[PDB]
Amino acid sequence: AFGHKYSEEGGLINESLRDQLLVTIQKTFTYTRTQAQHLFIILMECMK
Amino acid sequence: LEEVNEREHSMKASLQTVDIRL
């Protein structure tokens, strides 16, 4: 939802929101850092 | 009170990001 709020043109959630997204994933989901950036990549993939 | 709730959201995001950068 926090992706979809700022999503604009597909996965056009920007760089600040991408580091904030991966940080939240790494905090709430306890998902490792490269996997949190990966779940960003999957987030933008689905956000399209 | 709805304004306070949205304000709480901003404050909690700031606190979590500051805890990340500390």
- Find chain B residues with C-beta within 8 A of A23's C-beta: 17, 20
Question: Can you give the resolution of this entry in Å?
Answer: 3.5
Method used to determine the 3D structure = cryo-EM
Task: Kindly report the number of other CB atoms within 10 A of residue A16's CB atom.
Answer: 9
| DSSP H stretches of helix in A1-48 | 2-5, 15-28, 33-47
Give chain A's radius of gyration (CA, Å).
10
SS3 assignment, position A9: coil
B18 touches chain A (CB under 8 A): no
Distance CA A24, CA A13 (A): 14
Chain B residue with Cα closest to A28: B16
- A47 Cβ contact partners less than 8 Å away, ≥ 6 residues apart: A3, A4, A7, A10, A11, A12, A13
